[PDB]
Design a protein around this ligand. Structure first.
Ligand SMILES: O=C(O)CCC(=O)C(=O)O
Ligand SMILES: [Mn+2]
Length: 199
């Protein structure tokens, strides 16, 4: 279905409760904000980061910054639960040398979406991206190298971890409007953690 992608469904189930406590802690220092894309449009997905570097939008485009543009303070440190879960996930996928220095935390409110894009702000594209889904289920869609390539759908549920390596690392991807509902741990939203080798 996807070359280089290792899907580990429900892998983060045991760590989930502590990951949500740590997202809330990260958010108390660097709050969730809906970033404004270079063209002047506010994204529906609320984001924040933890680690040495953090993904953000800017006037000139998209970049990794060691400073939070909103608080003007550094991003919070990468929590131990985050580091430990990512490490075990990457190792189980055949990447024991993967050491992330950036974790983009996405919050999806009901109806929130993320249109087709590529993750190409990283120095080494051979390095994977570890994605961890928490809360409400979402339909992830992926294509190919071009923007007009056929889209394939994949449901990502609570605890699902996918290590996007190989060819799948360069694929155009996104999230369809989050369907309304309830989850015992997140109430009415979905969280997604994307660990990156940004330095
Ligand atoms: O929410 C997801 O599962 C994907 C998020 C994503 O692709 C991104 O933020 O770069
Ligand atoms: Mn992405």
């Amino acid at each position: 279905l996807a070359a280089g992608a290792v899907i580990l469904r429900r892998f983060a189930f045991n760590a989930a409760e502590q990951l949500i406590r740590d997202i809330n802690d990260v958010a108390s220092q660097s709050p969730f904000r809906q970033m404004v894309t270079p063209g002047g449009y506010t994204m529906s997905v609320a984001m924040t980061n933890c680690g040495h570097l953090g993904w953000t939008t800017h006037r000139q485009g998209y970049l990794y910054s060691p400073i939070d543009p909103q608080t003007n303070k550094p991003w919070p440190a990468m929590p131990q639960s985050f580091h430990n879960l990512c490490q075990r996930a990457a190792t189980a996928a055949g990447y024991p040398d993967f050491q992330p220095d950036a974790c983009l935390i996405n919050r999806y409110a009901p109806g929130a979406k993320l249109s087709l894009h590529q993750d190409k702000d990283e120095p080494d594209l051979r390095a994977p991206i570890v994605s961890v889904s928490l809360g409400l289920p979402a339909i992830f869609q992926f294509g190919g190298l071009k923007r007009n390539d056929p889209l394939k759908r994949l449901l990502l549920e609570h605890g699902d971890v996918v290590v996007w390596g190989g060819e799948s690392r360069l694929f155009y991807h996104g999230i369809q409007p989050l369907k309304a509902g309830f989850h015992p741990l997140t109430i009415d939203c979905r969280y997604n953690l994307t660990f990156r080798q940004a330095g």
